[PDB]
Design an enzyme around this catalytic site. Structure first.
Site, short mmCIF file in Angstrom:
data_model
loop_
_atom_site.label_atom_id
_atom_site.label_comp_id
_atom_site.label_asym_id
_atom_site.label_seq_id
_atom_site.Cartn_x
_atom_site.Cartn_y
_atom_site.Cartn_z
N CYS A 41 7.72 17.87 -13.71
CA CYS A 41 6.64 17.80 -12.77
C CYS A 41 5.32 17.36 -13.37
CB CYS A 41 6.50 19.13 -11.99
SG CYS A 41 5.06 19.38 -10.97
N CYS B 165 6.16 14.38 -10.71
CA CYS B 165 5.28 14.55 -9.57
C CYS B 165 3.85 14.13 -9.84
CB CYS B 165 5.32 16.10 -9.19
SG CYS B 165 6.93 16.82 -9.03
N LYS C 251 3.11 10.52 -11.33
CA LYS C 251 3.53 9.62 -10.25
C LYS C 251 2.43 9.56 -9.23
CE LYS C 251 4.94 10.85 -6.62
NZ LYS C 251 6.35 11.28 -6.50
N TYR D 11 14.71 7.67 -4.24
CA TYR D 11 13.29 7.99 -4.34
C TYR D 11 12.54 7.20 -5.39
CZ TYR D 11 13.44 12.57 -1.64
OH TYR D 11 13.58 13.60 -0.76
N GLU E 127 9.64 4.38 -4.91
CA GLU E 127 8.27 4.70 -5.29
C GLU E 127 7.80 3.81 -6.42
OE1 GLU E 127 8.08 9.48 -4.00
OE2 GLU E 127 7.93 8.95 -6.13
N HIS F 103 -7.11 14.02 18.80
CA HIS F 103 -7.37 12.61 19.01
C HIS F 103 -8.60 12.16 18.27
CE1 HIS F 103 -6.93 8.90 21.34
NE2 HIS F 103 -8.17 8.92 21.76
N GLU G 290 -0.93 13.16 16.50
CA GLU G 290 -0.80 13.53 17.90
C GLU G 290 0.41 12.90 18.54
OE1 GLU G 290 -3.70 12.10 20.71
OE2 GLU G 290 -4.52 10.66 19.20
#
Ligand SMILES: Cc1cc2nc3c(=O)[nH]c(=O)nc-3n(C[C@H](O)[C@H](O)[C@H](O)COP(=O)(O)OP(=O)(O)OC[C@H]3O[C@@H](n4cnc5c(N)ncnc54)[C@H](O)[C@@H]3O)c2cc1C
Ligand SMILES: Cc1cc2nc3c(=O)[nH]c(=O)nc-3n(C[C@H](O)[C@H](O)[C@H](O)COP(=O)(O)OP(=O)(O)OC[C@H]3O[C@@H](n4cnc5c(N)ncnc54)[C@H](O)[C@@H]3O)c2cc1C
Ligand SMILES: NC(=O)C1=CN([C@@H]2O[C@H](COP(=O)(O)OP(=O)(O)OC[C@H]3O[C@@H](n4cnc5c(N)ncnc54)[C@H](OP(=O)(O)O)[C@@H]3O)[C@@H](O)[C@H]2O)C=CC1
Ligand SMILES: NC(=O)C1=CN([C@@H]2O[C@H](COP(=O)(O)OP(=O)(O)OC[C@H]3O[C@@H](n4cnc5c(N)ncnc54)[C@H](OP(=O)(O)O)[C@@H]3O)[C@@H](O)[C@H]2O)C=CC1
Lengths: 462, 462
Positions: free
Chosen positions: A42, A47, A50, A181, A185, A451, A456
């Protein structure tokens, strides 16, 4: 001579640190063994670095819109070394914080490589010294998979995600191999930052385990961003040339004949074809600890191994390879062992995930096809939309937003949410709480919209 | 001669359009009266053009980070006219879409200003022609409030949000008066785009109706962004000068003496001090329709006026002045009237809202002080965090993220969520669904995090 603890944790990554820290809060006498850098994948090669590179890419992509938003253009070159240095400094700051977290929790740090001994009472050895506890957690993670030379001669000339974080310059020409992944990425980051980038995939689409809508859309967005997606294509051989690497590819599109192509002048060949567990040198056989054929530690729903007093969490087990999963499983285990909560365990259903593509992807729950298999076609109803976010109302460059809600049974329980679009990285978490609570479509439509946002649209599907 | 309909809607803004379109789906014979542009405040002088300008600001603020992210600096000037033209074109595209939505629904558009007649049977007149229906919805919205000349001589020299959307150039020097949504959003946009901006507020903080944490943090972020916040300050007089406007201010800080200051050379004075309902020329007295002292139409929980067959929704009623509220109330009313759903009505609790500040604010539910009043101090527990998003790990410029969860009773029901930070605009919607479902803190902590994001901090508070 053997030092005894309540809890011995092998590996100082996400899962191991989280479990040790929670155990210590409950009074356990704990130690963590770490052979390399605290924070594991990580912090060091995953993580965090990255995400810094994603933010750099994201920045660059938005800046192609600067003149459309009323500013004079921004026409110079990216300098990889600038951001590499800052990224490395952030990693170093985190290494120091993680070490201090252990000190503050009075968790002993044992530096070195652990392996089990054949003492019937489970014991590990680190640098010739032995350690024992009634509870030992294996949290050793994984590593990148690379092809064997016997399969792909020259494969060792490529790098993996580990080597990506050692790059000191932007590669001029990049070929990324794989379709999950990391491939998505890394291709997106390298292409956004100016590398001439190809993504070599075995089938027609990336992210094939994701909902079909996401697999389709992500593939299209990569192509529209300038990533060359080489479909039905696989590497046969790699050679060193005067001008970089030459990659020999075979392409075999259904309905066509197979064709061999050389790709010359490649600066960076990146293998992104999965991970394998870090168990080879643990001496698991000395205790009979069960693994699969790939080396993953086998566990039950409570993270027990087949050996009493030994547990495993995180990537080493091969299930749901995400930082928050390792953490949550490790914490739940600490509560079971040290708070005596016999039913404490992680539910592996409804775990949310984000792919840091351009735009990002969010998903939780079942794909439409998984729901049909589970509930029956007549008992699944999907709701979806596609639109161009209003961010792009004034820009020449475009990205789309796609959303799908998968509902089950007469009450239309929301069993899956799938999206790609600007903001989707930050949008998903709250929807995941609702899904975990068993939200129905009526619960979504009873919530007033915000909004103007993209989010939404998920509460106004019809 | 009088034309009869099932449903007459006065005002073609958010609420009126939404109610008419849903009524038509149920078979109603409907017409909408509109004196100006379809789409009302939202499309023309509100939500949409605001958001375009926010995106322009946001872009500019991020670009001050371009060199920190490895690119050569971007040092030219913003051109207001570029974005104004594109913004105006988007508004025109939306006007055309909204008109087509009515055509597709077979809703008659009546152009002109409606007023009631004194026919005992409720009837309106538009351009000398009369129209009647058993159901008439008043959805006429509001307008900006400005000071009276008798109170503040020269007040008419200032503009409001309406005039903001007519500006053809960036004002060099801006003074924004008020302390709510518009003042915060407009000050932030003008200052980000290069205006030398002051925000003149009656007390010490902005957004005083929001949770105290948000009021404090928003005020601090404005100051750190370069907005000069003039506390305990009010305008006494405005004069035209050779060099713009001169604004006479009184400042009266508690514990100090009052002081008069002239602010010279102001190009733009913007009044952002609330809205007043658009009812003065409706002839409400001809039917005895009840208003408050400010002119808001009075309604019950079902949007009934005191007169049978007449209803009101949206800003004209003075409650929860948001586009999605007008829409949701208007749709629920259509179902009550035309699907005969006697219990269909909008719940005004747990309505989420975002303030488009820098960074944005999201909130749903009760403030900590509101929860203490409702449940008792001993029955409220708050959880909070503050951090610097990792976006800024590599930047010299900083913004914070603050989050607060307000929980009630032994089960720790989540009764309020309050945040400010990067991403908070897109993060809130899903959390609002969970709150509407009665989520507890345990429901949040049972949801696995998404890493690395800001949103995960809301599911990992302790
Ligand atoms: C490029 C990349 C990007 C990613 N991005 C994300 C993302 O955005 N979000 C996300 O949730 N997940 C992401 N992941 C996945 C995530 O990083 C992993 O799921 C998580 O790090 C696994 O944690 P862990 O505790 O199982 O193992 P690790 O963090 O891998 O920790 C294992 C530790 O054990 C140590 N060790 C191994 N064997 C021994 C031994 N015998 N003795 C002592 N020490 C030993 C290792 O040195 C290491 O520090 C990413 C992964 C990669 C590779
Ligand atoms: C600057 C600004 C920014 C905002 N930003 C947001 C935001 O980001 N998010 C959000 O949710 N809310 C926002 N709002 C609030 C939102 O715009 C309003 O809540 C919403 O537009 C109110 O809708 P409505 O249908 O009540 O009225 P309106 O949209 O105001 O519609 C009323 C319509 O009635 C017409 N009319 C009036 N009287 C008559 C008559 N007698 N005959 C015929 N026609 C008549 C008017 O011309 C108008 O078109 C913002 C408002 C402003 C001013
Ligand atoms: N944002 C996040 O949360 C991130 C999480 N991670 C985690 O780490 C894990 C490992 O990532 P990654 O390495 O991308 O693995 P993945 O398993 O995600 O994807 C690899 C994909 O490459 C393809 N592939 C497999 N073998 C080969 C082969 N020999 N040649 C060519 N293609 C092949 C397959 O797709 P196909 O069958 O279509 O060819 C396979 O699904 C992720 O699954 C994820 O759990 C990693 C990065 C980011
Ligand atoms: N993002 C969104 O959803 C947006 C929604 N809107 C909606 O439109 C509404 C109207 O916005 P706005 O006009 O900002 O009104 P608001 O009511 O939000 O804020 C005005 C504030 O100005 C202060 N004020 C009032 N009278 C005076 C006076 N005479 N002199 C100086 N200050 C005064 C008060 O704060 P104090 O007592 O502290 O002085 C008052 O609360 C919002 O409340 C919101 O409902 C508007 C913009 C954006």
């Amino acid at each position: 001579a053997v030092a005894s603890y309540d809890y011995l944790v092998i590996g100082g990554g996400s899962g191991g640190l989280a479990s040790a820290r929670r155990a210590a809060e409950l009074g356990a006498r704990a130690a963590v063994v770490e052979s390399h850098k605290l924070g594991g994948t990580c912090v060091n090669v995953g993580c965090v670095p990255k995400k810094v590179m994603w933010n750099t890419a994201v920045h660059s992509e938005f800046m192609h819109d600067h003149a459309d938003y009323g500013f004079p253009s921004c026409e110079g070159k990216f300098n990889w070394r600038v951001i590499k240095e800052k990224r490395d400094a952030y990693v170093s700051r985190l290494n120091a914080i993680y070490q201090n977290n252990l000190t503050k929790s009075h968790i002993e740090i044992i530096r070195g490589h652990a392996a089990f001994t054949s003492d019937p009472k489970p014991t590990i050895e680190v640098s010739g010294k032995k350690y024992t506890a009634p509870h030992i957690l294996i949290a050793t993670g994984g590593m990148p998979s690379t092809p064997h030379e016997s399969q792909i001669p020259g494969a060792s000339l490529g790098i993996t995600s580990d080597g990506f974080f050692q790059l000191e310059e932007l590669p001029g020409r990049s070929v990324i191999v794989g379709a999950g992944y990391i491939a998505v990425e890394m291709a997106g980051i390298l292409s956004a930052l100016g590398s001439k980038t190809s993504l070599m995939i075995r089938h027609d689409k990336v992210l094939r385990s994701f909902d079909s809508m996401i697999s389709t859309n992500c593939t299209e967005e990569l192509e529209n961003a300038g990533v060359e997606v080489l479909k039905f294509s696989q590497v046969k051989e790699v050679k060193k040339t005067l001008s970089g690497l030459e990659v020999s590819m075979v392409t075999a599109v259904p309905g066509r004949l197979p064709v061999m192509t050389m790709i010359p002048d490649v600066d960076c060949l990146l293998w992104a074809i999965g991970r394998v567990p870090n168990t080879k040198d643990l001496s698991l056989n000395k205790l009979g600890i069960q693994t699969d054929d790939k080396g993953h530690i086998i566990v039950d729903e409570f993270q027990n191994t087949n050996v009493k007093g030994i547990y495993a969490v995180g990537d080493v087990c091969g299930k749901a390879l995400l930082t928050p999963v390792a953490i949550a499983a490790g914490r739940k285990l600490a509560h079971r062992l040290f708070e005596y909560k016999e039913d404490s365990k992680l539910d592996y259903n409804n775990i949310p995930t984000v792919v840091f593509s351009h735009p990002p992807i969010g998903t939780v729950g079942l794909t439409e096809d998984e729901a049909i298999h589970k509930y029956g076609i007549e008992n699944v109803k999907t709701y979806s939309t596609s639109f161009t976010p209003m961010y792009h109302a004034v820009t020449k460059r475009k990205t789309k937003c796609v959303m799908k809600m998968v509902c089950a049974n007469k009450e239309e329980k929301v069993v899956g949410i799938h999206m790609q679009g600007l903001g989707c990285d930050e949008m998903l978490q709250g929807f995941a709480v609702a899904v975990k609570m068993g939200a129905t479509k009526a619960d979504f439509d009873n919530t007033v919209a915000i909004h103007p946002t993209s989010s939404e649209e998920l509460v106004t599907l019809r």
